[PDB]
Amino acid sequence: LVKISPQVSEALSNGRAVVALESTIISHGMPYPQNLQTAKEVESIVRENGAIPATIAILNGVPCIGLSEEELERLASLGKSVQKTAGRDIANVVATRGNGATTVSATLFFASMVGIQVFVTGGIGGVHRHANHSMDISSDLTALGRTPIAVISAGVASILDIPKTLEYLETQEVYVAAYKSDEFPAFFTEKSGCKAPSRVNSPEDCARVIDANMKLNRQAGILFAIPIPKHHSSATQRALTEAREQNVTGNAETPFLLARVNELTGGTSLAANIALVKNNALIGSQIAVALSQLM
Amino acid sequence: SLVKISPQVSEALSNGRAVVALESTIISHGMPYPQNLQTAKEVESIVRENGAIPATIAILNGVPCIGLSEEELERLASLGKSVQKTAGRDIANVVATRGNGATTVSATLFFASMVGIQVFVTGGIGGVHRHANHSMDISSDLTALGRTPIAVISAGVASILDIPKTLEYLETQEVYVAAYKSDEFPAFFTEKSGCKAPSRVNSPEDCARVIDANMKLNRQAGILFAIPIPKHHSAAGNLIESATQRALTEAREQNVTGNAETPFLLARVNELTGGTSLAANIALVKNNALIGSQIAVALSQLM
Amino acid sequence: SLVKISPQVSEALSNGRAVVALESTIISHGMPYPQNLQTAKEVESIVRENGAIPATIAILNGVPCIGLSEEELERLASLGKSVQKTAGRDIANVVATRGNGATTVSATLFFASMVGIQVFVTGGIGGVHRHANHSMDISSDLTALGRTPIAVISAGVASILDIPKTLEYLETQEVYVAAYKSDEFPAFFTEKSGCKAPSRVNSPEDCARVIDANMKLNRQAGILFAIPIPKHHAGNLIESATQRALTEAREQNVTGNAETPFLLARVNELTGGTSLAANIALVKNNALIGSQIAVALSQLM
Ligand SMILES: [Mn+2]
Ligand SMILES: [Mn+2]
Ligand SMILES: [Mn+2]
């Protein structure tokens, strides 16, 4: 049922480094054709650092692990009209023969299915603000707690509740480590105000943790949090307030906040988002190559 | 081989024919005698009339049974609340003590999945309770469905519970939730919850195709289909909702907690509504049995 | 190998003799040197005296150890609180960095399950913290027990934590919870929690039959047995001190890694050693009943 691209299939069969990539960043992070440009630049960074990129999406009901140029452009061109597909939506998107842009929870599922150990993303979903009134908590976190894969993120955006997100990850048995810092990063910016529960200082360090996790057959995964580079590192609070006073909820809520943050920052937040996923791709690829060498 | 599968259920499973799992806590605990027995038998009949084989699940003298005889349904109904209300976490204890257990959604999920039944019909699923922010009272039904790949066919979640938070928790647990032929998530006794359904399916065949995909993908999380109570009962919803609110207030003012709480609320609502809520409960489980059996048959045809 | 199994534990596993897992955070962090070592030896002796083999679990120089020698116990105890408190999520990192780690319930569950040990004695399990409704601080011990089919033998949950919410969370995770010979769920240092136990078991054989059924059913969730501290082994004092310690931690914003050690230390200071003495008594009692459960289970099988 799942279609693995020729390049990814070759790599997996030969034990070469593969880096999984998600597609909601393509459909919902930015408009066409900038979304396509970024996805291709991310894939190029993966290839230029010795790994094979496996962008995951669902197209016409077919889960695809590894996308061709045609599939990337086709996905990107549909823009925000593509179904944002969490793990729980996969079966429905398949059954309806639809297109789906897979989130972290869905991409985890497919990456694990075929034995990809490293999954590069921008930021992971989290515990939402005021969750003690709503219980709005991303399935990304639950999925990572029972999928043994390493997610390479730039931390968690302050749109979400970062302290509670860290607590929920801990409850779900997810190892969380910041890269070359004692501070947990906050996606757009390096400062979250939260201490990192653990630290790793090199791609080789990361690969050794992953290797141990694999060998032990633990069922919980890992969140690496790579602070956005210092050269690429009010709007959130105002966007949040506006969000409440205009009662934006459900599926509209998260796209509204990110868009508002981008508008209020005049493109600065999106630019940072682009910079961080590229940085995650660099470090993630180095981790994957180091891991492949270990194995 | 701790579990006993009846000849009728084993015959169906071995031949890839449609089977619908049914729970037994609605019999011993969820409904009074003898409507509890009457309804259980009528549900099994509806399952058969639509081409599937009913598999009511319970534990009898420490033996997990998948497929029950009429005398066993009668025993569960007659012994009533003296039968252990058996959640998944109670199964081992009821087996060890050689007791009788009427299985809830979390326990019935476990046994149905164990023997390869894909469709499980119930009235409603447990949920996040009201004031869960102070209590953290959240049904194991939700956790169980998040890690058991089976389709539960319900009429949604009762307003006794916190429906918006229940929907959030299901999402966090990776459970696909879809309302049947509606954009509104149903609230058990009534179709009106005030909550948008996160997804929608419009036919038994639609449902079967989602289940089929879930199976082929080997996902470990399950599915909640939520079937709004038939329109013929819509006039009763405001009444049952009003009584629900009064019963909740009464439970609080009388400090009814623990194992007493849920039975108190169901009984009180039926008393306040003069039997209307039980009548609605009977109608919705019959409707769920109808649609659930059609889903199971469609799925069997797909495979 | 993935793990180093001690000669005594390996022999027991191969010959079907009852084995009781033990954790090491109680040694490195839960108790001071040398009371920690003294108690660990006494607990292991109690396990042996009732017909089982103790398997204290830790990570030493990056190697998971199942079963410890006298030398290794001395090592964990003397290095004390400088050893990494190692939850399940920390195992891979402690292994990768070749470090020493004292394993909590969530980590010890993982290693016990790996080698097929069914009974794991601890003092108390982590829980839902007070004010979790603001913090969402909920121990991974609970999540782990909900998806690891092992019987944890505890003395309940300390009132430093939110006992009612801990019981609710365990229920949500499908963990069977039973108090031993009581209708009241125990509160670690003291037998009185003010919470009714959701279920009750009255003998080690009762417990073993529940475990046996859980095993035969292939359920993926575990069991918490809660053994009330012996009536002869101050409860009134430790509860009063607990309330005071909680207030102090709040007024001083003690958070993160500092919080739980602060509360346990403060309660012991405020009670003049009474709570540590109770902690020693309850882990010995858990070892007694837990080993009897493990032997009864081995006999059943
Ligand atoms: Mn959400
Ligand atoms: Mn409950
Ligand atoms: Mn904690």
Strand partners, C21: C55, C120
Contacts with B, C 127-156, CB within 8 Å: 128, 132-133, 146-147
Provide the CATH topology of domain B130-303. Answer: Indigoidine synthase fold (3.40.1790)
**Ligand 2 midpoint to CA A245 (Å):** 34
CA distance C155 to chain B (A): 20
Instruction: Find chain C residues with C-beta within 8 A of B134's C-beta.
Output: 133
Strand partners, B190: B187
- Contact by Cβ (8 Å): B143, B173: yes
**Ligand 1 midpoint to CA B168 (Å):** 7
Other CB atoms closer than 10 Å to residue B158's CB: what's the count?
28
Specify the DSSP class assigned to residue B44: H
Q: Pick the ligand that lies closest to the CA of residue A142.
A: 1
DSSP class per residue in chain A: -PEEPHHHHHHHHTT--EEEE-SHHHHHSS-TTHHHHHHHHHHHHHHHTT-EEEEEEEETTEEEES--HHHHHHHHHTGGGSEEE-GGGHHHHHHTT--EEE-HHHHHHHHHHTT--EEE-S----BBTTHHHH--B-HHHHHHHTS--EEEE-B--TTB-HHHHHHHHHHTT-EEEEES-SB--BTTBS--S-B-S-EE-SHHHHHHHHHHHHHTT-S--EEEE-PPPTTT--HHHHHHHHHHHTT--GGGHHHHHHHHHHHHTTTHHHHHHHHHHHHHHHHHHHHHHHHHHH-
User: Does the beta carbon of B6 lie under 8 angstroms from any beta carbon of chain A?
Assistant: no
DSSP class per residue in chain C: --SEEPHHHHHHHHHT--EEEE-SHHHHTSS-TTHHHHHHHHHHHHHHHTT-EEEEEEEETTEEEES--HHHHHHHHHHGGGSEEE-GGGHHHHHHTT--EEE-HHHHHHHHHHHT--EEE-S----BBTTHHHH--B-HHHHHHHTS--EEEE-B--TTB-HHHHHHHHHHTT-EEEEES-SB--BTTBS--S-B-S-EE-SHHHHHHHHHHHHHHT-S--EEEE-PPPTT--HHHHHHHHHHHHHHHHHTT--GGGHHHHHHHHHHHHTTTHHHHHHHHHHHHHHHHHHHHHHHHHHH-
- Please tell me the distance from the alpha carbon of residue C217 to that of residue C93, in angstroms, as a whole number: 34
CB contact under 8 A, C171 and B89: yes
Specify the DSSP class assigned to residue B220: S
- Contact by Cβ (8 Å): A199, A217: no
Comparing CA positions, the residue from A29, A271, A236, A221 lying closest to residue A128 is: A236
A14 burial class (0-12, 13-18, 19+ CB within 10 angstroms)? Answer: exposed
Homologous superfamily assigned to B1-117:
Indigoidine synthase domain (3.40.1790.10)
User: Does the beta carbon of B175 lie under 8 angstroms from any beta carbon of chain A?
Assistant: yes
CB contact under 8 A, B174 and A86: yes
**How close are the terminal C-alpha atoms of chain C, in Å?**
28
For residue B170, the chain A residue with the least C-alpha distance is A139
In the Cβ-directed half-sphere of B137, how many Cα atoms lie within 13 Å? 16
- Please tell me the distance from the alpha carbon of residue C55 to that of residue A182, in angstroms, as a whole number: 35
Q: Indicate if B130-303 has the same CATH topology as B1-117.
A: yes
Tell me the count of B-C CB pairs closer than 8 A.
Answer: 73
In the Cβ-directed half-sphere of B182, how many Cα atoms lie within 13 Å? 24
Three-state secondary-structure class, residue B139: coil
Read off the tokens for C145: 């027990």
User: Does the beta carbon of A167 lie under 8 angstroms from any beta carbon of chain C?
Assistant: yes
Q: Pick the ligand that lies closest to the CA of residue B262.
A: 2
- Please tell me the distance from the alpha carbon of residue B39 to that of residue C164, in angstroms, as a whole number: 36
CB contact under 8 A, C172 and B143: yes
Interface test with C, best of A205, A216, A222, A287 (most C CBs within 10 A): A216
User: Does the beta carbon of B87 lie under 8 angstroms from any beta carbon of chain C?
Assistant: yes
Read off the tokens for C199: 């279920």
With a CB cutoff of 8 Å and minimum separation 6, the contacts of A22 are A55, A56, A101, A102, A103, A104, A106, A107, A119, A121
The pocket of ion ligand 3, defined by CB under 5 A, consists of: C 137
B146, B164, B217 ranked by CB distance to A1: nearest: B217
Could you tell me how far CA A259 lies from the centroid of its own chain? 18
Contacts with B, A 221-280, CB within 8 Å: 250
CB contact under 8 A, C219 and B137: no
Instruction: Find chain C residues with C-beta within 8 A of A196's C-beta.
Output: none
- Contact by Cβ (8 Å): A95, B295: no
CB contact under 8 A, A139 and B178: no
- Please tell me the distance from the alpha carbon of residue B192 to that of residue B179, in angstroms, as a whole number: 12
- Please tell me the distance from the alpha carbon of residue C10 to that of residue A186, in angstroms, as a whole number: 47
- Contact by Cβ (8 Å): A276, A228: yes
Strand partners, C72: none
- Please tell me the distance from the alpha carbon of residue C233 to that of residue C191, in angstroms, as a whole number: 10
Specify the DSSP class assigned to residue B120: E
**Partner chains of A (3+ C-beta pairs under 8 Å):** B, C
Dmax over Cα atoms in chain C, in whole Å? Answer: 55
Provide the CATH topology of domain C4-235+280-300. Answer: Indigoidine synthase fold (3.40.1790)
- Please tell me the distance from the alpha carbon of residue A270 to that of residue A157, in angstroms, as a whole number: 12
CB contact under 8 A, B172 and A142: yes
- Contact by Cβ (8 Å): A151, A122: no
C92, C106, C147 ranked by CB distance to A212: nearest: C92
The secondary element (H helix, E strand) that includes residue B251 is helix B237-253
User: Does the beta carbon of A213 lie under 8 angstroms from any beta carbon of chain C?
Assistant: yes
Across B155-272, the runs of DSSP E, i.e. the strands, are: 176-180, 200-201, 223-226
- Contact by Cβ (8 Å): C267, C275: yes
Q: At what angle do helices B261-272 and B237-253 cross, to 10 degrees?
A: 130
CB contact under 8 A, A95 and B199: no
Read off the tokens for B97: 């003590």
With a CB cutoff of 8 Å and minimum separation 6, the contacts of C12 are C18, C19, C53
Q: What are phi and psi of A248, to 5 degrees?
A: -85, 120
- Please tell me the distance from the alpha carbon of residue C240 to that of residue C257, in angstroms, as a whole number: 24
Which CA distances in Å does B234 have to A101, B184, B200, B229, B244? Answer: 38, 14, 20, 8, 16
Comparing CA positions, the residue from A143, A172, A140 lying closest to residue A156 is: A140
Q: What are phi and psi of A168, to 5 degrees?
A: -65, -40
| Cβ contacts of C178-183, under 8 Å, gap ≥ 24 | C178/B93, C178/C207, C178/C210, C178/C223, C178/C224, C178/C225, C178/C226, C179/C226, C179/C228, C180/C207, C180/C225, C180/C226, C180/C227, C180/C228, C180/C289, C181/C228, C182/C228
DSSP class per residue in B47-65: HHHTT-EEEEEEEETTEEE
- Contact by Cβ (8 Å): B62, B98: yes
The secondary element (H helix, E strand) that includes residue B22 is strand B19-22
CATH code assigned to A3-233+270-294: 3.40.1790.10
- Please tell me the distance from the alpha carbon of residue A290 to that of residue A207, in angstroms, as a whole number: 6
CA distance B173 to chain A (A): 6
**Ligand 2 midpoint to CA A164 (Å):** 24
**Ligand 1 midpoint to CA B245 (Å):** 28
In the Cβ-directed half-sphere of C104, how many Cα atoms lie within 13 Å? 21
Q: For chain B, what are the domain ranges?
A: 1-117, 130-303
Instruction: Find chain C residues with C-beta within 8 A of A217's C-beta.
Output: 114
Dmax over Cα atoms in chain B, in whole Å? Answer: 55
Tell me the count of A-C CB pairs closer than 8 A.
Answer: 74
**Ligand 1 midpoint to CA A137 (Å):** 5
Method by which the coordinates were obtained? X-ray
**How close are the terminal C-alpha atoms of chain A, in Å?**
28
With a CB cutoff of 8 Å and minimum separation 6, the contacts of B43 are B22, B54, B121, B285, B286, B289
- Please tell me the distance from the alpha carbon of residue B20 to that of residue B153, in angstroms, as a whole number: 10
Q: Pick the ligand that lies closest to the CA of residue A173.
A: 3
Instruction: Find chain B residues with C-beta within 8 A of C219's C-beta.
Output: 88, 91-92, 110
With a CB cutoff of 8 Å and minimum separation 6, the contacts of A34 are none
Q: What are phi and psi of B12, to 5 degrees?
A: -65, -50
